[PDB]
Amino acid sequence: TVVVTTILESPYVMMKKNHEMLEGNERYEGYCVDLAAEIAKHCGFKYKLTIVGDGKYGARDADTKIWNGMVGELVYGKADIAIAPLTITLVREEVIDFSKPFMSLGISIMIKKGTPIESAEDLSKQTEIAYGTLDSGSTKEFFRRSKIAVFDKMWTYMRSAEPSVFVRTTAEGVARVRKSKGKYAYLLESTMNEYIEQRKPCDTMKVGGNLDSKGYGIATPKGSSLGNAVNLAVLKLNEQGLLDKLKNKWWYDKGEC
Numbered sequence: 001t002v003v004v005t006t007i008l009e010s011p012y013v014m015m016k017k018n019h020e021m022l023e024g025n026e027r028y029e030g031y032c033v034d035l036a037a038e039i040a041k042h043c044g045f046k047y048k049l050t051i052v053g054d055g056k057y058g059a060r061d062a063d064t065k066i067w068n069g070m071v072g073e074l075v076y077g078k079a080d081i082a083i084a085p086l087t088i089t090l091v092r093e094e095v096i097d098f099s100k101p102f103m104s105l106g107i108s109i110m111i112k113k114g115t116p117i118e119s120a121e122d123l124s125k126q127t128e129i130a131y132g133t134l135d136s137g138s139t140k141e142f143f144r145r146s147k148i149a150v151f152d153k154m155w156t157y158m159r160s161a162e163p164s165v166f167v168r169t170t171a172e173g174v175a176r177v178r179k180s181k182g183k184y185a186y187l188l189e190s191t192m193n194e195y196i197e198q199r200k201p202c203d204t205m206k207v208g209g210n211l212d213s214k215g216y217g218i219a220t221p222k223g224s225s226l227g228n229a230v231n232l233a234v235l236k237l238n239e240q241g242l243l244d245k246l247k248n249k250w251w252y253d254k255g256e257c
């Protein structure tokens with residue numbers, strides 16, 4: 001009975017509208033939920049979906065150097081596999097094993113629908129409409145490290161803009177976009193942006209192309225006997241369309257706009 005650690009992040013895994021009535025594994029739903037079923041189907045095992053203990057994805061702690069979130073749960077033997085939007089980064093591929101990407105993304109732009117800007121280039125030149133990123137994360141560092149013209153030029157601005165274009169939480173940013181009446185563009189991972197654009201208050205939208213390329217993968221403990229099977233499962237699901245099928249499912253069918 002494989003112990004699956006995952007996490008609450010819409011539309012990857014969510015609590016059923018009447019979850020308090022359903023029990024066990026049926027209490028949940030979302031892209032990753034469906035995906036877990038396919039993995040397990042194609043792999044031939046029984047599983048128990050468990051929401052990650054401390055609610056984090058996974059990072060080494062500032063002092064302890066010890067892994068937290070799902071990564072940690074995987075490194076220290078608490079769970080057997082992680083099925084969630086876990087971006088495949090070096091730091092993690094050094095301690096746990098990733099399947100091939102099951103979905104992809106990149107830093108994109110979120111503008112309040114109807115906004116003049118349409119690309120990063122369109123922003124870089126601009127000075128009228130402000131814009132920023134989360135205060136700390138993939139996105140924030142990508143720019144303070146990016147040696148590309150269009151991006152270096154952008155870092156400088158956000159770098160010391162006042163008020164600060166940065167935001168403490170990920171929803172807080174989206175909030176500024178809307179309430180800023182158009183004087184604010186947010187840069188966030190393409191997946192979140194897409195979701196939000198299909199949500200109520202349909203007043204935002206993703207614009208331009210992704211400024212980079214990443215991808216989410218399924219994680220298993222180093223030495224796991226599920227490793228090889230899982231990776232092959234992700235490949236087959238992609239080869240039969242099931243993934244796109246799903247991404248389209250939770251972002252559009254379930255979309256509200």
Ligand SMILES: N[C@@H](Cn1ccc(=O)n(Cc2ccc(C(=O)O)cc2)c1=O)C(=O)O
Pocket residue numbers: 009057058085086087088133134137138139140170187188189191192
């Ligand atoms: N990929 C992450 C996990 N994950 C998955 C889906 C999602 O919507 N978010 C939310 C999120 C997206 C972009 C930013 C940003 O950079 O402004 C901040 C928060 C998330 O953090 C993992 O690899 O750690």
